[PDB]
Design an enzyme around this catalytic site. Structure first.
Site, PDB file in Angstrom:
ATOM      1  CD  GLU A 176      29.952  43.213  43.193  1.00 50.07           C
ATOM      2  OE1 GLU A 176      30.796  42.727  43.976  1.00 50.07           O
ATOM      3  OE2 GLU A 176      30.072  43.045  41.932  1.00 50.07           O
ATOM      4  CD  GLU A 177      32.768  42.522  47.311  1.00 50.71           C
ATOM      5  OE1 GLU A 177      32.050  41.505  47.428  1.00 50.71           O
ATOM      6  OE2 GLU A 177      33.822  42.513  46.634  1.00 50.71           O
ATOM      7  CG  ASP A 187      33.872  42.553  40.146  1.00 52.98           C
ATOM      8  OD1 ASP A 187      34.923  43.226  40.421  1.00 52.98           O
ATOM      9  OD2 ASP A 187      33.131  42.115  41.059  1.00 52.98           O
ATOM     10  CG  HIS A 192      35.710  37.629  48.043  1.00 52.46           C
ATOM     11  ND1 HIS A 192      34.386  37.478  48.388  1.00 52.46           N
ATOM     12  CD2 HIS A 192      35.749  38.618  47.121  1.00 52.46           C
ATOM     13  CE1 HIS A 192      33.653  38.328  47.692  1.00 52.46           C
ATOM     14  NE2 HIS A 192      34.455  39.023  46.909  1.00 52.46           N
ATOM     15  CG  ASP A 223      36.166  41.923  44.062  1.00 52.79           C
ATOM     16  OD1 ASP A 223      35.254  42.616  43.581  1.00 52.79           O
ATOM     17  OD2 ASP A 223      35.958  40.990  44.854  1.00 52.79           O
TER      18      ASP A 223
END
Ligand SMILES: [Zn+2]
Ligand SMILES: [Zn+2]
Ligand SMILES: [Zn+2]
Ligand SMILES: [Zn+2]
Ligand SMILES: [Zn+2]
Length: 328
Positions: free
Chosen positions: A158-159, A213, A297, A119
């Site tokens: 993105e995050e 992703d 994550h 990721d």
């Protein structure tokens, strides 16, 4: 107005090229060399993030692609932040673009240093690896004058910085989508658009965006998330099937097949870098597993939890897919 056909006739990859795309023999060390450059924390605004961007830009400038660094500043829950999308285009004059995309920023994790190996270090590396491994054939394709090219987009930001929200996430993609939507153009300015295509701005030149992703864990399951691009998605299914028939996939034992690309659709939507494009009618294929890898994550989204055989299998599928789409 039922069953509209895909605008570009999709010609099946020759057996010769399939067999050729499907032997990643000893490529292997080359991919890993690429990947090691991404297996660092890449937090927005950091030095390491800066350095990863420089590595992307240089890798693609060295292959004679047109590379644009689309940098800008944006407001976040952590204050104003600098962001920089990288847009690389093989042939900028070609009217139509097959767009492959990923994000190169990593999550700022509360509990400690986060690598985000799936990721999206792996996807980032896969895009550069596709460009390098197919360079010979892409450079030949570039001079055909056929109005199609490959474009790679490495999105920044993105995050989410805090809780994922429409305001807190997708900084790079929201920025780029608006920009390309506002930048007007037409067929007459471009190289060889398809006959009855409607180009009014830069975003209309994106023929399909394929977003990668969360790749690199063992045994992902993909589904067609959009009816619109079912004809494109079906090509991944068919490619994977041919690779298995040819015995070109890495499996633990004989008489096994990979089944990454399920030949079904799923009822689920994933808040991601494709959305602001979706609202502007860019067809999307989202190559992202469902469910997410277990490491998602967590600090265990790291290098050692990557699965080499799955990654080499995915690389074969992606190379074959680009080859088939662009008729390399
Ligand atoms: Zn009807
Ligand atoms: Zn910009
Ligand atoms: Zn993430
Ligand atoms: Zn991600
Ligand atoms: Zn999605």
């Amino acid at each position: 107005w039922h069953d509209l056909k895909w605008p570009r006739d999709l010609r099946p990859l020759a057996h010769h090229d399939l067999l050729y795309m499907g032997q990643i023999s000893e490529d292997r060390g080359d991919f890993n060399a690429t990947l090691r450059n991404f297996l660092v924390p890449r937090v927005v605004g950091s030095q390491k993030h800066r350095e990863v961007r420089e590595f992307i830009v240089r890798s693609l400038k060295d292959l004679d692609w047109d590379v644009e660094e689309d940098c800008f500043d944006g407001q976040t829950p952590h204050g104003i932040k600098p962001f920089c999308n990288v847009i690389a285009t093989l042939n900028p004059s070609a009217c139509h673009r097959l767009v492959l995309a990923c994000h190169y920023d990593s999550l700022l994790h509360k509990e400690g240093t986060f690598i985000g190996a799936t990721d999206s270090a792996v996807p980032c590396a896969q895009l550069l690896y596709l460009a390098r491994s197919l360079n010979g054939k892409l450079q030949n394709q570039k001079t055909r004058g056929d109005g199609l090219t490959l474009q790679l987009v490495f999105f920044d930001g993105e995050e989410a910085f805090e809780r994922w929200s429409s305001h807190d996430s997708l900084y790079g993609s929201r920025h780029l989508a608006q920009k390309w939507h506002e930048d007007r153009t037409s067929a007459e300015r471009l190289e060889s658009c398809l006959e009855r295509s409607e180009i009014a701005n830069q975003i209309d030149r994106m023929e399909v965006m394929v977003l990668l992703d969360l790749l690199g864990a063992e045994n992902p399951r993909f589904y067609s998330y959009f009816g619109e691009t079912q004809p494109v998605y079906r090509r991944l299914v068919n490619i994977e099937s041919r690779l298995n028939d040819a015995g070109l996939m890495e499996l633990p034992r004989r008489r096994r097949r990979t089944n990454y690309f399920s030949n079904s659709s799923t009822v689920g939507f994933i808040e991601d870098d494709h959305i602001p494009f979706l609202k502007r009618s860019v067809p999307i294929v989202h190559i992202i597993p469902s469910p997410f890898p277990d490491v998602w994550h967590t600090l265990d989204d790291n290098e050692q939890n990557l699965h080499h055989p799955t990654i080499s299998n995915l690389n074969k599928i992606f190379k074959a897919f680009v080859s088939e789409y662009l008729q390399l």
